[PDB]
Amino acid sequence: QGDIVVALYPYDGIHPDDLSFKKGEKMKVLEEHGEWWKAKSLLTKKEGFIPSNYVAKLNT
């Protein structure tokens, strides 16, 4: 369903809905499409689209 990923670099909140995340930050994926998955910021429940490049899976 929703896997957990960690940001390797800050995203860049440019869109009004994009979820901003920083490097080393942990995020929860809810629906990974094919290039931009919408994760949730553990900071305080932030939900926004995250790029499939900045963040990486907890594994590799």
Binding site: D12, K23, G34, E35, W36, S52, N53
Partner: peptide
């Protein structure tokens, strides 16, 4: 080291994926 501030380019967003809602 020296810099300490990396950041790869993001994806393109299929049909405004990470852009707007749908």
């Amino acid at each position: 080291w020296d810099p300490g501030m990396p950041t790869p380019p993001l994806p393109p967003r299929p049909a405004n994926l990470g852009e707007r809602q749908a």
